[PDB]
Design a protein that fits this description.
- It is classed as hydrolase.
- Keywords: autolysin, peptidoglycan, glycosidase, hydrolase.
- It is built from 10 helices and 4 strands; from the N terminus they run αββααααββααααα.
- The protein is mainly α.
- It has one domain.
- Strand 1 and strand 2 form a beta hairpin.
- Helix 3 packs across helix 4 and helix 5 crosses helix 10.
- Bound molecules: a molecule of 2 linked components (AMU-NAG) and chloride ion (14 copies).
- The site of one chloride ion has 3 residues, from helix 3.
Length: about 220
């Protein structure tokens, strides 16, 4: 179980490698992050981003629906978020928080899906290519997996996170974002503050319901 493979400096050089997309929000839009910004963002500073999200939390449907109140297309879908938690062993507070970041609090125009013929495809976790061209050409994960409803996008997103990240030993946000076992490969997002945004919402929800934190991992680099 020895997944500590690289020094921090080695990992930084890899994250700064040729063509690797690393972005930051500036003047209201996303721009490429510079080398210093990338390095700063990946620095370990001790802690929601380091918490194991493969452990479930005791949240009832009513509690999850409280989190989802006023969240657009996600409102009143707490039953299904909990279906996903139990089927796939995925922390439901994490799952909600991720969906809220990825969909603009459930209110973005993209969160309402992409039409293709008689069907509409939904994607609430930023998974794969998700625009009209990718849906038309058929080179969209959401279309491939037939996420033809919001509920199917909630379940399927969870299934994807479990099967592709959690089963790959990327068990916390930091690992999902920066894959320290194999730096610069298989990273969930280009936004250098992706983990911080999800972690902030998670912490608020933990403190709202009095939830206890699961295991926090400290060490990633030689
Ligand atoms: C969840 C997702 O789709 N995230 C995008 C991410 O893809 C990850 C790795 C995934 O499919 O789970 C994507 O990362 C690149 O993906 C291409 C394959 O499409 C790879 O060839 C690259 O090596 C990946 N790069 C890294 C650094 O992992 C990124 C690209 O910016 O976008 C994420 O939204
Ligand atoms: Cl480059
Ligand atoms: Cl990339
Ligand atoms: Cl309930
Ligand atoms: Cl929008
Ligand atoms: Cl995302
Ligand atoms: Cl895709
Ligand atoms: Cl992609
Ligand atoms: Cl639905
Ligand atoms: Cl990759
Ligand atoms: Cl990997
Ligand atoms: Cl981070
Ligand atoms: Cl506090
Ligand atoms: Cl608890
Ligand atoms: Cl470390």
């Amino acid at each position: 179980a020895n997944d500590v493979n690289y020094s921090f400096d080695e990992a930084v050089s890899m994250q700064q490698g040729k063509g690797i997309v690393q972005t930051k929000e500036e003047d209201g839009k996303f721009v490429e992050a510079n080398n210093n910004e990338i390095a700063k963002a990946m620095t370990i500073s001790h802690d929601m981003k380091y918490m194991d999200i493969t452990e479930k939390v005791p949240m009832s449907e009513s509690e999850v629906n409280q989190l989802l109140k006023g969240k657009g297309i996600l409102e009143n879908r707490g039953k299904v978020f909990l279906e996903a938690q139990e089927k796939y062993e995925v922390n439901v507070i994490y799952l909600v928080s991720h969906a809220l970041v990825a969909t603009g609090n459930g209110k973005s125009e993209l969160a309402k899906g992409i039409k293709d013929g008689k069907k509409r495809y939904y994607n609430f976790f930023g998974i794969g290519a998700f625009d009209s061209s990718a849906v038309r050409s058929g080179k969209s994960y959401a279309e491939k997996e037939q996420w033809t409803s919001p509920d199917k996008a909630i379940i399927g997103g969870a299934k994807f996170i479990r099967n592709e990240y959690f089963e790959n030993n990327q068990l916390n946000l930091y690992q999902m974002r920066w894959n320290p076992e194999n730096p610069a490969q298989h990273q969930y997002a280009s936004d250098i503050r992706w983990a911080d945004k999800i972690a902030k919402l998670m912490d608020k929800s933990y403190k709202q319901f009095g939830i206890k934190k699961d295991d926090i991992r400290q060490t990633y680099y030689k």
